[PDB]
Amino acid sequence: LRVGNKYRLGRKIGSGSFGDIYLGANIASGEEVAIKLECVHIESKFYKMMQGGVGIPSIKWCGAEGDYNVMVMELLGPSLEDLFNFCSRKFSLKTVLLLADQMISRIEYIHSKNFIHRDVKPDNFLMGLGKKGNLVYIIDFGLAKKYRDARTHQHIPYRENKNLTGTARYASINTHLGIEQSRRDDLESLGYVLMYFNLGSLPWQGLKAATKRQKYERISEKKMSTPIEVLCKGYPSEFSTYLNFCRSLRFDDKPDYSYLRQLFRNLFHRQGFSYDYVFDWNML
């Protein structure tokens, strides 16, 4: 159905607690686009304030189309989780390091603009299209939220007893504890995703859990009993240094992004990798 006067709806590509994603187009220009339908805005504030950033998708139209809330953004490519499968869920160290630099930068971008993602995972990272093909994009469906006042820059208050927000498998340890999330948390999650790409699955993954709750319970338990040095055994120390650093951050602490990025470029240099920017999936 014709929506936003100029966008034709189309096949639905994905469902989610967030709503549904449909492929669609622009009757006028004819540009493939993605559209999200939500049962009759917090995501809108994040996008229009991340606008212009590298790896931040463009929103082309916001509003209600009858009983639903619409959001149209530029079409992007596969997610890192899709590519992970395309590559037998085994990423070379180089691709992991290549991705690590970009992903740390997106997160820092969101942070420099008073927001925390809160659901950092393979699935929320999509590759660009065309010549933006090697650019990693970050997508927010609705968990992004301010962590400081745009004006004053006062960091939001500390809080406990909060229910699990974002995916359990990649959640920071304090999130599991019910602690208000902050920048440190977006980073820690990224820590687990990076280890997830090296191992192929985290040790708290696929836990025999009778019910939902017991599920988040077992994962939380397994995550807190798995020491970093055990989780990263057999891999470059940088991954241990990364996770340990994030887990050290105070609640309102400002992360040292460059230190983290450099942690991985020092490792890139020492492996002797070629600086040819090619990810595993564009190789034979």
Ligand X SMILES: Nc1ncnc2c1c(COc1cccc(Cl)c1)nn2C1CCOCC1
Residues making up the annotated binding site are 13-21, 36
Q: What is the chain's alpha carbon radius of gyration, rounded to the nearest angstrom? A: 19
Which residues, 38 to 57, sit near ligand X by CB under 6 A? Answer: 43, 57
Q: What CA–CA distance (Å, rounded) separates 10 from 85?
A: 26
Number of residues that bind ligand X (CB under 6 A): 15
By beta-carbon proximity to ligand X, the closer residue of 141 and 279 is 141
Residue 71 backbone dihedrals phi, psi, to 5 degrees: -155, 120
The two tokens of residue 193 are: 């995703």
Tokens 């942690």 correspond to 263
**Catalytic annotation on 119?**
yes
14 binds ligand X (CB under 6 A): yes
Q: Of 136 and 263, which CB lies nearer to ligand X in the complex structure? A: 136
Q: Which of residues 82-111 bind ligand X (CB under 6 A)?
A: none
In whole angstroms, give the CA distance from residue 115 to residue 43: 11
Estimate to the nearest angstrom the gap between the alpha carbon of 67 and the chain centroid.
Answer: 29
279 binds ligand X (CB under 6 A): no
For ligand X, the closer of residues 14 and 203 by Cβ is: 14
Cβ closest to ligand X, residue 129 vs residue 228: 129
Show the beta-strand stretches assigned E in the chain: 2-3, 7-8, 12-14, 20-26, 33-39, 59-65, 68-74, 115-116, 125-127, 136-138, 145-146
Detail the residues annotated as belonging to a binding site for ATP.
13-21, 36
Residue 36 in contact with ligand X, rule: CB under 6 A: yes
Q: How far is the CB of 141 from ligand X (least distance, A)?
A: 5
For residues 136-155, which are near ligand X according to CB under 6 A? 139, 141
Q: Is 13 in the site for ligand X (CB under 6 A)?
A: yes
d(CA 47, CA 109): 12
Decide: is 167 part of the binding site for ligand X (CB under 6 A).
no
CB contact at 8 A, 119 and 143 = yes
The residues of the shown chain that bind ligand X, judged by CB under 6 A, are 13-14, 21, 34-36, 43, 57, 71, 73, 75-76, 79, 139, 141
Catalytic residue IDs: 119
